[PDB]
Each structure stands twice: as structure tokens, then as C-alpha cells.
From Swiss-Prot, chain B:
Record note on disruption phenotype: No expression of OmpC or OmpF during growth at 0% sucrose, low expression of OmpF at 15% sucrose. Single deletion of envZ has no OmpC or OmpF at 0% sucrose, low levels of OmpC and very low levels of OmpF at 15% sucrose. Deletion of both ompR and envZ leads to loss of both OmpC and OmpF expression at 0% and 15% sucrose.
Protein name according to UniProt: Sensor histidine kinase EnvZ
Additional notes on this entry: Cross talk between this and the Che and Ntr two-component systems can occur at least in vitro.
Residue numbers binding ATP: H62, N158, A159, A160, R161, Y162, D183, T192, G193, L194, G195, L196
Protein role: Member of the two-component regulatory system EnvZ/OmpR involved in osmoregulation (particularly of genes ompF and ompC) as well as other genes. EnvZ functions as a membrane-associated protein kinase that phosphorylates OmpR in response to environmental signals; at low osmolarity OmpR activates ompF transcription, while at high osmolarity it represses ompF and activates ompC transcription. Also dephosphorylates OmpR in the presence of ATP.
Location relative to the cell: Cell inner membrane
The organism's taxonomic lineage, starting at the top: Bacteria, Pseudomonadati, Pseudomonadota, Gammaproteobacteria, Enterobacterales
UniProt comment concerning the protein's domains: The periplasmic domain interacts with MzrA. The periplasmic domain assumes a PDC sensor fold. The HAMP domain by itself is intrinsically disordered. The cytoplasmic dimerization domain (CDD, residues 223-289) forms an osmosensitive core; increasing osmolarity stabilizes this segment, enhancing its autophosphorylation rate and consequently, downstream phosphotransfer to OmpR and signaling. The autophosphorylation activity of the CDD is inhibited by the angucycline antibiotic waldiomycin which probably binds to it.
UniProt-reported outcome of changing H62V: Does not autophosphorylate, does not transfer phosphate to OmpR, increased expression of ompC, decreased expression of OmpF
Mutagenesis / variant outcome for changing D63A: Autophosphorylation by CDD is resistant to waldiomycin, CDD peptide probably no longer binds waldiomycin
Induction record: Part of the ompR-envZ operon.
């Protein structure tokens, strides 16, 4: 029973790396290996369902917050003119709420030239197994950072060497969360992140 | 055989939520060592993900509590003419704080007495003895009493919030568990809040299934 144990080890290895689509072998036997295998299958199913519903909690929070925060937004429109700065302040705070929630959910969510071309629609372009939405979000966050701290230009470029896609700005939580999102996205595709402010991503 | 049994029990303890349990036989030069290493890798992965989830969730909850506090401060500098506005906004902020507090209160109770064998009608009756409710119950399952309690609680609360009048809680069996809450309110489209998401997460923790139809039924494994 050495080989089945080794295969189960392989199963644990695959599950540990995020592969919840992998078949669990040796489920059809009445010995200890069978029991273990069945347990592994149950865990795999649970982990997959949980993986799918990961966003659901924060999305629920946003949903429940959507009604009262909107009523507050409405209340600021029937305020006096003397309290304009107050209404503006409140609105900015609500906007901050939105930014935080959306960014955290974006984190929990975690052809090149095609999607790179898609995100585009001042931006300068020098173009040459994936998750299109993930890459899209990554480029979005990179551009957001480059705009947030780079005063003016933003250069998005491609190329090849063996996949290389890079955003470069002209500049001298929040931002680190976005960078963490980019990092997670590029780590999902077995890639590498490269700073130099220039952000290059390999695939 | 024996090390396989030990690793089996350990893995059972990990699957039921205990990510701090030590994995034995990790330092062996046979296949048992390989298996133990793999299980340890899984445990490290799950623990890392969970801890990072808790940390980031706490941080984000706080960061959300920040601008909500600023708005509450802002209504204290409004004119006397806009008193009713400030009043309303204060009420809404109270609601928001209630929501975030619910989120935190849920994320606080991690794992306790792992998974025992409790009676469904017992905990259902417990939730019933808290808050018109009509009961048509039918049974023991492996679970966590507090989690299920929270689920039923949130479902009843939601059914009260959206169902104008009655709330019906029922049990029964199929090849084996289902508890269902019904209201008389508008369903979701002829063609979900924090509570329902919490219910979903809880029933997903117990390898179950959530089914809407508004009538929300939750399934749980038995043998």
C-alpha cells in the first residue's frame, strides 16, 4: 500500500497549491486508505465551495451598507448652502468607503496584447494559460498607482524573450493593497514581479 | 496501519477546522513521511490563508469604521435648520455600525469544541426560544452548535426583515438533514445581505448545501 499512499501525497500536494479540480483517487476501498481518501474528497468539495463564496461575505457587507449610505447621500442634497463643505466632506467619506470595500473585494477575488489593448479604452502604448479578468484587474491597478504617484505620463509596453508586460510612470491600506493584488494575480499565473518607478510582469 | 490511522485522525481534526494541530510522523524515511509532509503542506497553506483573511478582514473593518466615524462627527456641526437631516444620517450610521459589528462578531468566533454529535431539533428549538413563528419539525448530526445556531438566527432575522408576518421553520430527512425557513415576502426576481452570506459560509463549513425557493433550506450530511 505504498503506491496509494504516495498518490494520496500527490493529491494533498495538488490541493495545497489550489488545484481543487483534481481527482481524488483510492476512494473506492474499505481500508484506512479509503477512509482517508473519502475525507480528502469531502475536504476538497468544501474548500472548492468556500473558494467560490469567498467574496460573498464582503459583498454582503457592501450590500447591507448600500441602503443607509445612499440615504445619507440623499440627505446631503437637501442640506443648506451654508453647510456645503459638510455635505462635500460626507460625500468624500462615502467615496472612501466605496474605495476601501471595492479594493478589498478586488483582493479577495484573487493573448496579451488583446487584453492590454482592452484596458486602454495620457497613455502611451508600446505593445509587441491565463485569466483575462485577473490580468485586466492587474493592469487596472498598475495604471491606478502610476497615475496616483506619477505626475503625468503613463507608458504601457509589451515584448517577448523566452511574456513581459510593463507600466512605467514619471513620479519621484491602499496602494500597497493594490500592489498586493497585482502580486497575487501574477503569482496565480506562476509569474514574477519586477520593480525598477517601472513595474514589469513576466508570464 | 497505525501511522495511517494517526494521520487519518489528525487530518480529520484539520478538516473540521483545527489548523493548529501538530502533524505526527513528519520525519520518517518511508511513504508515511511523504504523506505527513504533504498533509503538513496543506495545513500550512490553509492556516496561512485563514490568518491572512482574519487579519485583513479586521484591518478593513477598522478602515471602514474610520470614515463612518467622520460622518457622525460631521452631523454634529450642522445647522439647527438641518437637525432632521443630521438625525436621519445618525440613524443610518448607527445601522452601518451595526452591520460592521455583525461582521466582526462573526469573524471573531473562529473554532471551539471542534465537531460534536448534536440533535437538530434541539438547537432549532434553542433558536426558536429567542424570538409569529410557526413550527413543523420532523435527528442528530455532526456539527458545531453555535455556528448552526447563528445560521438559523440570521435566516429567521432575514425572514422577519423581508417577510411581512409569518415565519415557518421546518425539518425532515432525505438520503440526511434539511432545515427550512419560510416567509411571506417578495422573493428574489420572478425571472443577499451579510446574514445570508454568513449562513452560506456556515453551511459550507459543514459540507452542506443552501437552497432558495422566499424559502431557504439548508442541507447537512449525517453518516
Amino acid at each position: 500500500i505504498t503506491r496509494p499512499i504516495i498518490e494520496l501525497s500527490n493529491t494533498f500536494d495538488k490541493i495545497a497549491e489550489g488545484n481543487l479540480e483534481a481527482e481524488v483517487p483510492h476512494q473506492n476501498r474499505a481500508d484506512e486508505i479509503g477512509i482517508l481518501a473519502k475525507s480528502i474528497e469531502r475536504l476538497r468539495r468544501s474548500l472548492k465551495q468556500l473558494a467560490d463564496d469567498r467574496t460573498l461575505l464582503m459583498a454582503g457587507v457592501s450590500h447591507d451598507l448600500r441602503t443607509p449610505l445612499t440615504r445619507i447621500r440623499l440627505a446631503t442634497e437637501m442640506m443648506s448652502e451654508q453647510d456645503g463643505y459638510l455635505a462635500e466632506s460626507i460625500n468624500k467619506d462615502i467615496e472612501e468607503c466605496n474605495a476601501i470595500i471595492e479594493q478589498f473585494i478586488d483582493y479577495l477575488r484573487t493573448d496579451l496584447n488583446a487584453v492590454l489593448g482592452e484596458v486602454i479604452a495620457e497613455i502611451e502604448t508600446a505593445l509587441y494559460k491565463m485569466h483575462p479578468l485577473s490580468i485586466k484587474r492587474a493592469v487596472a491597478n498598475m495604471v491606478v498607482n502610476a497615475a496616483r504617484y506619477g505626475n503625468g505620463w503613463i507608458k504601457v509596453s509589451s515584448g517577448t524573450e523566452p511574456a513581459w508586460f510593463q507600466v512605467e510612470d514619471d513620479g519621484p491600506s491602499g496602494t500597497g493593497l493594490g500592489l498586493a493584488i497585482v502580486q497575487r494575480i501574477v503569482d496565480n499565473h506562476n509569474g514574477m514581479l519586477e520593480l525598477g518607478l517601472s513595474i514589469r510582469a513576466w508570464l
